From a paper:
PurB is classified along with arginosuccinate lyase, l-­aspartase, class II fumarases and 3-carboxymuconate lactonase as a member of the aspartase/fumarase or β-elimination superfamily of enzymes. PurB catalyzes a β-elimination that is thought to occur via a general acid–base uni–bi mechanism.
Our structure contains one of the reaction products, AMP, bound in the active site and a nearby strong feature of electron density has been modelled and successfully refined as oxalate. The SaPurB subunit can be divided into three domains that combine to form an elongated structure. As will be described, SaPurB forms a tetramer in the crystal structure and this rules out space group I212121. The tetramer contains four active sites, each formed by regions donated from three different subunits. His141 in SaPurB corresponds to His171 in E. coli PurB and is the catalytic acid for the mechanism.
Numbering used by the authors:
A (entry chain A), B (entry chain A), C (entry chain A), D (entry chain A): 2 to 400, 404 to 431
The structure:
Amino acid sequence: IERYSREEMSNIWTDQNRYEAWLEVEILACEAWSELGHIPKADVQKIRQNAKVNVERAQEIEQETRHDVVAFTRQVSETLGEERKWVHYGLTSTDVVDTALSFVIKQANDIIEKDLERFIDVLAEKAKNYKYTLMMGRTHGVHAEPTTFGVKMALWYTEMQRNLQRFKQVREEIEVGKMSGAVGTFANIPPEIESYVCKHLGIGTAPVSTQTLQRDRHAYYIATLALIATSLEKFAVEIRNLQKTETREVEEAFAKGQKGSSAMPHKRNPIGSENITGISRVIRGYITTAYENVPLWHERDISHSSAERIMLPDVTIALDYALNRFTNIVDRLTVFEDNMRNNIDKTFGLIFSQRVLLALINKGMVREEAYDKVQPKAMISWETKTPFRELIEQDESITTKEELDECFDPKHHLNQVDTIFERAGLA
Amino acid sequence: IERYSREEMSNIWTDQNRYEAWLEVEILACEAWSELGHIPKADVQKIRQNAKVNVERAQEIEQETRHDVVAFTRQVSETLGEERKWVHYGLTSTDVVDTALSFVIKQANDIIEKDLERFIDVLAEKAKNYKYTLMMGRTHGVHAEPTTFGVKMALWYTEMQRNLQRFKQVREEIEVGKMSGAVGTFANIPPEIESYVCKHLGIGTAPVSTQTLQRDRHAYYIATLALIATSLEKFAVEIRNLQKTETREVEEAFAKGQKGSSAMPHKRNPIGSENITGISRVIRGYITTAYENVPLWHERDISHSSAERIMLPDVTIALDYALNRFTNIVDRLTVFEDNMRNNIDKTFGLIFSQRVLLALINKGMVREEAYDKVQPKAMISWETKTPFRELIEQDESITTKEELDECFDPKHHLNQVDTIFERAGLA
Amino acid sequence: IERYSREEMSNIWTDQNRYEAWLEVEILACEAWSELGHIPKADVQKIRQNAKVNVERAQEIEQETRHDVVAFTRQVSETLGEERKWVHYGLTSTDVVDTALSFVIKQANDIIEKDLERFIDVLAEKAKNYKYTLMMGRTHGVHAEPTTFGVKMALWYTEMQRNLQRFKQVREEIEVGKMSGAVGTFANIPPEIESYVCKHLGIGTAPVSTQTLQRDRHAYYIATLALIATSLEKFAVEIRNLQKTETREVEEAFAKGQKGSSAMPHKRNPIGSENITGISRVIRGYITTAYENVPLWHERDISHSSAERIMLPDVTIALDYALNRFTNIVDRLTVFEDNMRNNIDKTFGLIFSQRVLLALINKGMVREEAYDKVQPKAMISWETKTPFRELIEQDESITTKEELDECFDPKHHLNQVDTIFERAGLA
Amino acid sequence: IERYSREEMSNIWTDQNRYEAWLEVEILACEAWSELGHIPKADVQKIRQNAKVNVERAQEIEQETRHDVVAFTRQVSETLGEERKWVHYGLTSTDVVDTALSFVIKQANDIIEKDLERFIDVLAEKAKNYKYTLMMGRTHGVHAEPTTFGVKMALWYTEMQRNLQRFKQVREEIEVGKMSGAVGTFANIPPEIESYVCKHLGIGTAPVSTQTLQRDRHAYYIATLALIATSLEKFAVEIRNLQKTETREVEEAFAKGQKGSSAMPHKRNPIGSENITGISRVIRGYITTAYENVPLWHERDISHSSAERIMLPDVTIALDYALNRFTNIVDRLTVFEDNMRNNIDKTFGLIFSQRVLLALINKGMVREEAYDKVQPKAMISWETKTPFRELIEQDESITTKEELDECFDPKHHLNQVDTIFERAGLA
Ligand SMILES: Nc1ncnc2c1ncn2[C@@H]1O[C@H](COP(=O)(O)O)[C@@H](O)[C@H]1O
Ligand SMILES: Nc1ncnc2c1ncn2[C@@H]1O[C@H](COP(=O)(O)O)[C@@H](O)[C@H]1O
Ligand SMILES: Nc1ncnc2c1ncn2[C@@H]1O[C@H](COP(=O)(O)O)[C@@H](O)[C@H]1O
Ligand SMILES: Nc1ncnc2c1ncn2[C@@H]1O[C@H](COP(=O)(O)O)[C@@H](O)[C@H]1O
Ligand SMILES: O=C([O-])C(=O)[O-]
Ligand SMILES: O=C([O-])C(=O)[O-]
Ligand SMILES: O=C([O-])C(=O)[O-]
Ligand SMILES: O=C([O-])C(=O)[O-]
Ligand SMILES: [Cl-]
Ligand SMILES: [Cl-]
Ligand SMILES: [Cl-]
Ligand SMILES: [Cl-]
């Protein structure tokens, strides 16, 4: 997953940054105790200045201590003088590990939120730039009635707007800390320590907690980040569908898939969209794992920790990369407006049959009289390969021909587009 | 799943009720068109009065029509006179199927919401009724420090309060209708029809839609209802853990598992909690299915419909039954307050070691001097089977014995309970 | 799931049939004990003759007994005289429930195995009937080189042949019984009882067991039945792809989707394939549930039982219906051999570029000289809309034109078909 | 996942080793063509000697080529002279990528197979070393009847023996190659090339293939490797259950969890087992992803490739580490034989009630007379806290007391152990 990681998200999930987050939690812990008259401020001002993380040293110590917080606590302590004594004062491993983890998630969520807002903009501009670009609506892969590429982009815009709303919400659920002690009873640690750290780390407090944060928070979070990935797959599948050789209504404007410098000009592949699809299949795996991490035993068990070492970075790193790669795909996406408008007539004008029927009935004609002077001619249009108009024009529906144009006009279906865009927040 | 269905939820997912929901949508559709001057109101007032659903008749017609909305449309039409003509006027199958489905979900969500609020009350009363009931906090299945059964119930209370909040939110996402036509372009159906129906059905409108509602709504909904099921499993696993023979700290007060009328008095099983666990394993299955229903093709494809015929009833029926069965389990749950307080001393008072250490250091003693007059005696307490006090009392820690009571007092750990309950909204 | 159930599989999962399976297990249990001189044979010959199941009576008794085996045991006992006493002699609930469940699975597996062999035949005949039917191979949805519809059906044939092989194997894993007593120690029940029943029920014995069969058996079984469902989805997605309006290379020969008796002749939908896709999304859900049923506690816990009440019938009923509906779809599937052969030339003969290149180099020409008298003309073929031949024919590649036919001949790609069919076991 | 990776498996999934596997495939490809008289052997003997992989160079070239096989092909080519020309002769990207991937899996499967056989040995020795170690069988977490720790280890031994059998099978499904060309038609590449490479790489041939291997192979493989992970979780959950403070029947002999050098001797945690549980939650995620990779489009689509870049290494690396860490846990696992035998009497001898009942009836006594001189005394044993014997001895069941020893003897339940071990293949 170094091939599928952008730099900013990748750095967040390094050991450097996890230990630095433990340090901040620890130091802030001492600042909290100090306001409560347990530790002299001078000693804490010393700690902030002299404390340095060393990933290699901590990991040397970890092979003997067999415990990762103890190792960290010892490492930092080797960079300090006497103020060593206050490092981790009246705290338990997971008061740090878990408050710090929520902090790092807050950092990851800052990125993903920006990715989401960017993608929403890309979708807003694509929508407006193809507002009236007629193409075929398709149901079961079959031509039904026309629509516009702009409307399809508006469909996506509002989906993402739903997905952002969600994500914003789950952030308040997940960016939450805990410093409630060995069993969540605040027995040997007042709640004002938690209150202090979490305010300064810019996160909230779990009102009631165990040794660890409650994992229904994490699970919904994964659920959410997976929903975003799934709808990215939806969009990617659209592009894949529309880039098919027989359609050619859009094209990933990357030139990828070959043929640019070769003699195979037809090889225009949606491999980026295929990529996004496959990453989506991974993000969704961790729905299982995140959900199975909820039934921890009693106050705590640590099984969730090994699983979320792999899942939390993977899922945020994958999601960050998918959001941006597909934001680019969509931005650069090449839309063939003429191929779209051409494909409207692959069904020989049979999509405008109900309109010719209606046009006859709304002209003094009987509900069945009009039906028998359309249906048989409509049939022959499909069986032979000739326009639906040319067969209608032969029979006496003439005396009208001045406005069969209106029945066969796909621009009829644009009549509510301005409202669809208003509804979507794109006016 | 007739063994795991309560009556009110079961009736919602019958064919009677689905067709009745199609009828209401249809009739309301005609009321909408009528205000728009397409249909005479008299004909619609006729329709409401004369239209009757017949599940057997519709299904007879369906074996030849091979289409379920057409079948319905024909059935109702046989119960009407001339006003037949306006049934389904200017509508497409899925404008009804899907607006009606969202309506039936609204009905299911009314039940589940009530189940959630009831369970929250059961948890509020259990919390207050055991606010100060000392038991052992357990980490990795091992004794750590004391806590109270009331606090554990408060932990659950706030989880559910999170889960309700979620559920309330997703309801606004899911209880949403659509009457936007064959491809979501409003081309041949003004949006004021959708607006009319959905207001009268008490649901909202999808701003931009395809032939069908967008399935990220459904998926998050399932996600959510599965999270609630997973945390029910969490709680059920707690009960299972605590009802183990070696613990006996709680007991499903059902008398189930045998021994009441037999000569096997020790067989007190948590089979209800085991049941809830197993249903939870089913609800979570449909996370997959709901998520894989999102990548529909273009304007629509119908694959989601076969999957949500089974999933939507199953998941709501299962969840309704799990919420209520476990609400009862918890309400009736028998708590052995004495067994809890006894088990605190299965570790021979070794849980109060840090407090004796502290008590010595906070009395003029050196940080290490106090450590060497606890640790070796603490060790011998575990290896032999004798109280930690009796070995401390032999050595000159005397000159104090008047308040070793305070070090060995588990009621120390109650000092923040009143605040934990205040935080949880149970003051 | 009454809409998605065939009759034979549906009957297997009724209460009638589960109780009848408990009866047989019980009776056979008594026949076993009898050979071991615990029960007189006359009493057992009585039992077989007089014992009748009554689903309504058992369920009446179950509302007070609160236990389903006890209820059954009491019901049957009301249909017997004195020989009542031997019903369930020296047995525990789950020795019956679970040996009987494996038996009912054996019955379900008889159906599915037949469904699989039928589908394999349908695929063998489709393969042979289109052995040489040229169509376009497609990669990333884009034209690559030709293939034949027969070869594509052979691809499916061998997949299913893999899937049958698997299924055959997992049957030996799952069609396995247990009568080892309360904790699997054979303490109060010799193994020759288990041996007797299981031989007569036509199933094997779990060498070492707990109170219950070990659920890794069930999980692999579900895994398997889900793999079969997933590859059915694969095939269904192919059909869906190929039935798209722009392709029209195949068509579900059902006439479903409308237009037969209407004036919308273009509405030829693959709704059956869409259906199979959606059922597939359900079968895969129960991968989760089956796998989470493996970590039972100690000798047993009953959580697996509530989950497999719903899963085992659902998954077998769904899979039986999907196998047969799609076997029919494929059998009746209408293949448009001319549309296939036409679509080969939608890329204007650009798929035969490497062959013209090769044909020049394999004629005294330089590896690059031939490349510059193809590539630029190939490019112009795609940009304009004119055959690749017509632009090649203008330049002096003439002096040859007698066998540009061989370069542009798609029948080149049939040269190994007879071997592909031999490899697949279709010669 | 560098914290959860052993070295041998980790090296297999490096870029060095993937490119080296591409090289071997390529070179072998040239050896195949050479036997077929397309390439001079001297040129291929040159290629084998001069071709060197360079991971950094290939990745430099990949940022411009935007294609990873082309990049590789160019890199190796820079290490060769004129024999460059034959590198990748008449092959397509995925003939190499995918034949090579199957090869690397073969390598991974060599490791996992060894891990499985080692774990099976560890389980065989544990079984024999505790063959007769009496402990309580537990159902619903409650005492039922005795069993032995040896029998429980035999239960695990046979499970793993099932899991190995499976794994052996799926290896033949997965360790399979493909060199069938752009669309699997062998059109421009005889099957004897595939035959040649795959024989020399020690893998089999896919009889019918597309551009890529068919992903039902991979999915079953993941399914399988996840089943093994799930049963590891089962075992780990057992250990976790049994190491609980109230039980203390086993203990991870690592000394991990603290208290060795501290004054908290009761902190004996099963954190290794907790770890294995959490990794298991990850391996199972990729059931989803592997299964969703099966519906590729037509001849191929590349979405499976991004997902199996992450999944295939992760799942094999995780599984290798879980198998070995838990093999060690089990080997070193400390069994408290005395605590086991003590816990048998936590139910006050009530587990031997049916045996006292039987002992009275099998002595001239009536089926009900014996029931009323046990049940009421059994009840009082549980309500008070006094042995079941002491209350039986007060009533005239005397005139017998010489062999109440036989009724209350747990060594009764060992009577079939020698057969359970024979059944399991441990005699
Ligand atoms: N009660 C506990 N709270 C926090 N960390 C712990 C606890 N017990 C052990 N650990 C350590 O935390 C790490 C967990 O490992 P892992 O399962 O790989 O995340 C190991 O270094 C453990 O020794
Ligand atoms: N475009 C469509 N919109 C709504 N329903 C349809 C459409 N096409 C077919 N149907 C019918 O809806 C039902 C879908 O079946 P199922 O897949 O079992 O939910 C069948 O009766 C189909 O004939
Ligand atoms: N140890 C046991 N073995 C078999 N069945 C049991 C056991 N304990 C309870 N049962 C009953 O089996 C059924 C399990 O219910 P369910 O969870 O719905 O499958 C109920 O009727 C239980 O009372
Ligand atoms: N038809 C194809 N066969 C094999 N590889 C391809 C094909 N098309 C593109 N690729 C390349 O294979 C890699 C796939 O990327 P990923 O999705 O990250 O595995 C990229 O370098 C693609 O450019
Ligand atoms: O050692 C500790 O404090 C822990 O594990 O929480
Ligand atoms: O027939 C219809 O209207 C449909 O299928 O939507
Ligand atoms: O009552 C029984 O025998 C049981 O539950 O197994
Ligand atoms: O370029 C190629 O050969 C490919 O992508 O398969
Ligand atoms: Cl929390
Ligand atoms: Cl929507
Ligand atoms: Cl078994
Ligand atoms: Cl294959």
